[PDB]
């Protein structure tokens, strides 16, 4: 449309040397040109100074200072982040991640790495403390490394045990802009794909993660600037006490990529274990089952909201299931299970990080058991089957799945309590005059092998119907 009048004014131009002479006279006499350049870096052909130009464009894009010394060597330069492609330290590592991205045509991941390296050193201090602040992170990282190695000294456990029940976790050290990732949990479903063997080339995203970092806060805290574990209790870790240290206006963080919904009693348990307040302002509490459903539905997004009204449907092989997750059922205190989304847990010194993680592992395990109901499969109002189930919270870390007896007509309620990360105990609750359905250890076996409600309910139904 506008191109038609553009071609008409172009026909008027046919009816430019004077324009070049005008540009020359102005030469004898900003943002737009560089913006067009940064759009057009996509269309540059592969060549050595052109790739230097596109890397300079990445530098201008993420706010960093480019400097070439040749067509080979180009430096990205800011107050501490200084590295080349061919402050206060060497250029440490020829890291294969950045080189592997740049040897291919993967410049956006290079941009993400420079974004992460900006967000590491964007701390508010006058730059001197910044160095010391980064040093504190280094000390923390070293301590964290030792603890995982201490666990590897303790038992020669596989990576799965290192994830599920060990100290720290599967620990990927930092490399470029990617900060240090602890994998504290991987579910029995998310372990499997479409039956994964878990050998030490395990994926970064294969589970639930938490990245450790430093961040400037509004308060002042005392953090170590030295590797705090010089002496190690041979099966534990043991920390020499503080001061060294200095009172940086910052704190360590465990940032989760996807915010975890946690209950109120979790908030008090973690503020007891840490000592530092978690929610600086008090947030707006919500029922946990809303947040669990928003978490599980916002895993795989679609533009249509499900409009569930807490009545989820499950299409299974030899069965069809319905679930009522039943928020606002009252606890013994008289209130529903109220929780909020946590994303950043602040700790001061690294000895807290196993205990903290055990708490989060507990919480994440509980969410997976309530995560298995939240599905998008709509087998709406099918007259065959639709075994109508209910989930209610009797307490923190306990819940109950209530459902019709497969033989008789009284209710049967299976109460599940999540003791630890991989241990969930189960009790069948039955009328005094009913049929034998299952033993509790069978329910514990199916739960710990699958970590999903509907699979265990089908196991209950099938082992009832064989008898």
């Amino acid at each position: 449309l506008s191109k038609m009048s553009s071609l008409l004014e172009r026909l008027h131009a046919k009816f430019w040397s004077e324009t070049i002479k005008l540009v020359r006279q102005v030469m004898e006499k900003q943002h737009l040109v560089s913006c067009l350049e940064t759009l057009q870096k996509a269309l540059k052909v592969t060549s050595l100074p052109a790739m230097t130009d596109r890397l300079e464009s990445i530098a201008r894009q993420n706010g960093l200072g480019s400097h070439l010394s040749a067509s080979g060597t180009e430096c990205y330069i800011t107050s501490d982040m200084f590295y080349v492609e061919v402050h206060h330290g060497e250029n440490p590592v020829s890291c294969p991640e950045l080189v592997q991205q740049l040897r291919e045509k993967n410049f956006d991941e290079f941009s993400k790495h420079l974004k992460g390296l900006v967000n590491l050193y964007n701390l508010p201090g006058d730059n001197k403390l910044k160095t010391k602040m980064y040093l504190a992170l280094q000390s923390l990282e070293q301590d964290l490394s030792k603890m995982a190695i201490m666990y590897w000294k303790a038992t020669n456990a596989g990576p799965l045990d290192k994830i599920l029940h060990g100290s720290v976790g599967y620990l990927t050290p930092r490399s470029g802009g990617h900060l240090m990732n602890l994998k504290y949990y991987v579910s029995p479903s998310d372990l499997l794909d479409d039956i994964i063997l878990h050998e030490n080339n395990v994926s970064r995203s294969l589970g639930m993660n938490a990245s450790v970092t430093i961040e400037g806060t509004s308060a002042v805290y005392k953090l170590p600037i030295a590797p705090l574990i010089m002496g190690s209790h041979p099966v534990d870790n043991k920390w020499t006490p503080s001061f060294n240290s200095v009172d940086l206006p910052a704190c360590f963080f465990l940032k989760f990529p996807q915010p975890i919904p946690v209950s109120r009693a979790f908030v008090q348990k973690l503020q007891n274990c840490t000592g530092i307040p978690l929610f600086e302002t008090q947030p707006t509490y919500a029922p946990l089952y809303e947040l669990i459903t928003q978490f599980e539905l916002s895993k795989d997004p679609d533009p249509i909201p499900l409009n569930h009204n807490m009545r989820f449907y499950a299409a299974l092989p030899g069965q069809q299931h319905c679930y009522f997750l039943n928020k606002d059922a009252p606890l013994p205190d008289g209130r529903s299970l109220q929780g909020t989304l946590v994303s950043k847990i602040t700790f001061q010194h690294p000895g807290r990080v196993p205990l903290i993680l055990n708490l989060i592992r507990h919480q994440v395990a509980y969410n997976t058991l309530i995560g298995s109901c939240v599905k998008r499969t709509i087998l709406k109002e099918d007259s065959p089957g639709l075994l109508q189930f209910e989930v209610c919270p009797l307490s923190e870390s306990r819940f109950s799945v209530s459902f019709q007896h497969p033989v008789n007509d009284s209710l049967v309620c299976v109460v599940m309590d999540v003791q630890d990360s991989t241990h969930v105990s189960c009790k069948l609750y039955k009328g005094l005059s009913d049929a034998l359905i299952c033993t509790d250890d069978f329910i514990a076996k199916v739960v710990q092998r699958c970590m999903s409600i509907p699979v265990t309910m089908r196991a209950i139904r099938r082992k009832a119907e064989t008898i």
Binding site: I20, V23, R24, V33, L36, E37, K44, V45
Partner: protein
Amino acid sequence: FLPLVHNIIKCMDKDQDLNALKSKFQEMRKLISTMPGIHLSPEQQQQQLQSLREQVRTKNELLQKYKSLCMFE
């Protein structure tokens, strides 16, 4: 094509007429690469190729028929 326009923009950020006339001469080279010898739509090229394939097939089949056929014994 377009990286020369990029160099003209880079020269404008630096400051010229030379690369502009080189772009004009490049469009003259574009005329020389419009010379080749193809003018029909590619559908018409496909029609011509299929018709000529059928022609060579039927002519070879006729000549093979008269290779094999003797009117006399």
